[PDB]
UniProtKB/Swiss-Prot annotation, chains A, B, C:
It catalyses: 2-iminobutanoate + H2O = 2-oxobutanoate + NH4(+); 2-iminopropanoate + H2O = pyruvate + NH4(+). It comes from Capra hircus (Goat). It is found in: Cytoplasm; Nucleus; Peroxisome; Mitochondrion. Homotrimer. Interacts with YTHDF2. The lineage of its organism: Eukaryota, Metazoa, Chordata, Craniata, Vertebrata. Pfam families: Ribonuc_L-PSP (PF01042). This is 2-iminobutanoate/2-iminopropanoate deaminase. CDD domains: YjgF_YER057c_UK114_family. Keywords: Acetylation, Cytoplasm, Hydrolase, Lipid metabolism, Mitochondrion, Nucleus, Peroxisome, Phosphoprotein, RNA-binding.
Length: 136, 136, 136
């Protein structure tokens, strides 16, 4: 508690991603690992879900993750694991097609499945874990 | 498998948290990272859910997490990521109000959402990841 | 981004586990931590769920995880955290009985609960996190 190295622990916060609607940080950097909170397809300015259903929500959620990554000195190539929570399993393929446009190489490990309900009636919510570079 | 440092890996076990009802440890410390098993609002002495519904269950689950943290040389300030699994999304705000009483600063990254069912008919289950200090 | 050590980041890929059905890697090794994608009870050769329901699916999912671990220089003793996603909470005990045959000591931290639906109509999906040895 004093006998080992003191590791970085930094709260990541950017107005380019939505404000919190509960007692949480957008992301936490600890040592070099970044835990990103689950992101809905929420407009950063209004705090409400973007219109147009699951495809548009997925694009916005991933955009939000990208801005949090950038605030933490990373990009999508630093992501090592993601979780995609769906309101409808039948949206699996369509959300995958959005996802692949952001995660273009060194693809993260992943789980994707249908939950009973998301906050605000979201159709998709995406969590991620990243590691600060350099990565060989 | 012998050419790198041998990292600490320690099973965390305290009678101040409930006994296992399956093949799992309360938590695992590996290097400085602590993975805590999902905690229901179970009374540590009886192994049954405390009465009074989701608010009381959330308080008990977080109390249980606190005792596991303490057994691992940590407190709630060491938590970096939590997951709150709900039986009912409409309980989001009320569980947040309990949660904020324990996680009072450096708030963890978080995801919270409704699943189809929890063991024992629990109304809430909370998982967490912590990192042993010092943290700067 | 150049001022710290360059950590290993390696995509784990083995034909002894099923091919991807989306934009993801079977596992990612980053430093010494291995994030394994969620595994259904899919036959590695055919890419379809094995017959016989949840018990047989759980055995196949864990077999698949074991082959991914082996490709990453690990075995089941390196696992520190697992998540068991069920189509039916009433299968909790039966899946635990399969799980315990693979995870025989130093049991991982765990969460297990029922989701609304899994890809392909799977009855069980298992994710895991491991750390490369040596572990003391
Ligand atoms: Ni110390
Ligand atoms: Ni070695
Ligand atoms: Ni650098």
């Amino acid at each position: 508690g004093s006998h080992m190295s003191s590791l970085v622990r930094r709260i990541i916060s950017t107005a380019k991603a939505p404000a919190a609607i509960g007692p949480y940080s957008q992301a936490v950097l600890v040592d070099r690992t970044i835990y990103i909170s689950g992101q809905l397809g929420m407009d950063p300015a209004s705090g409400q879900l973007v219109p147009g259903g699951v495809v548009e929500e997925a694009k916005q959620a991933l955009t939000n993750i990208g801005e949090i990554l950038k605030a933490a000195g990373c990009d999508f190539t630093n992501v090592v694991k993601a979780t995609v929570l769906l309101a409808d399993i039948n949206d699996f393929s369509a959300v995958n097609d959005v996802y692949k446009q952001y995660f273009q190489s060194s693809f993260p490990a992943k789980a994707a499945y249908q939950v009973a309900a998301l906050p605000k009636g979201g159709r998709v919510e995406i969590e991620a874990i990243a590691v600060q570079g350099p990565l060989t």
